[PDB]
Ligand binder design. Sequence first.
Ligand code: HEM
Ligand code: CL
Ligand code: CL
Ligand code: MG
Ligand code: MG
Ligand code: MG
Length: 363
Amino acid sequence: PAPVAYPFDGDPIRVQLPFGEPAWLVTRYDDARFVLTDRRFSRHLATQRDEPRMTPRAVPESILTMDPPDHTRLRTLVSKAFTPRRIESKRAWIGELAAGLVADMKAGGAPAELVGSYALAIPVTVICELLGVPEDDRTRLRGWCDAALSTGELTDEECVQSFMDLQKYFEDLVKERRAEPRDDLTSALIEARDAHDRLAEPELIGLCISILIGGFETTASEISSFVHVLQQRRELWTRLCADPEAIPAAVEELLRFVPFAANGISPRYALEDMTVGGVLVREGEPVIVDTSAVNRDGLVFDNADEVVIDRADNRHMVFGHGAHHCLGAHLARVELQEALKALVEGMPGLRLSGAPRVMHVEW
Ligand code: HEM
Ligand SMILES: [Cl-]
Ligand SMILES: [Cl-]
Ligand SMILES: [Mg+2]
Ligand SMILES: [Mg+2]
Ligand SMILES: [Mg+2]
């Protein structure tokens, strides 16, 4: 087919992202399950092909560009450190943090700018605390944080200097924690072993960066979009004010419902010619799962285009599937649950004044 421009039956669609080669776009859940689970699809060809992507720089090698067995080694090592216990043990604290940020907005008076004061504030502080970045070094991360969230108007060179600054900073942090270990994720990653296997210094630095960048904008955008969606369907906001125990269910359903601009899921490359949902995918061609479409696939989700908080069997793909399923999924869930909880408890009368980049709120 002639490719169509992406971002903008059920058969895969030929698309052209802003950069890279043309790709097949998968919109059906059943098709996506194959693409993301099966060992006949590869990520590591990313770095030998011209990867469909939103930004011009060729993609750096990372945990997200690996295939089993190299990938499995990395995930095994990371799972020794990034454990569900280490995550849950932070829930109360994340809750206190969230409550404190709501109280800070209150003390400043309406209107507050929710993106900057809340949606961005929670994940950057949570990730930093987890990683062990001290408060008096967090200024080093601000450049990236601006680069991730903006258009206005960082230079090409400021972006690359701010990303290299992440490398430089995390190199220092990894050296410091190797020499003086602490109770943080960075030290636990350095200490992780699987027999004699361990993460090399460049792998540690890369993982710290992958954690920060995987957790920051994603979590931030979802907090902002959750609040937007709940405010436009205010009957749902009110329900959560009346029934804060429904928040975990509501987080799952908002994760399903909130549409991604681009592909949150990275391209997978066919290792041999295969038909997927009726189209021939050639050896070496990329296939992109559209998270938003798959999460609205009416063959799987009844009333897919409505928000149904208590939806039974809400097995969405917002965190992907298969081997590369979001390392941070549990942490993200904790952050989103506690973010919504603090807002509905602290500001049940919240309304919009004028994901979003800026979003002003009164109460
Ligand atoms: C709402 C928040 C989040 C969303 C929607 C999200 C989404 C995703 C998705 C879709 C993937 C798979 C990409 C693919 O297979 O191509 C992924 C992977 C990843 N996520 Fe997240 N994520 C979120 C939060 C986090 C957090 C808080 C962290 C870290 C603490 C994190 C770290 C990562 C990492 C390291 C990977 C790569 C895993 C691998 O390749 O094995 N994410 N995430
Ligand atoms: Cl042929
Ligand atoms: Cl999941
Ligand atoms: Mg299979
Ligand atoms: Mg140094
Ligand atoms: Mg109850």
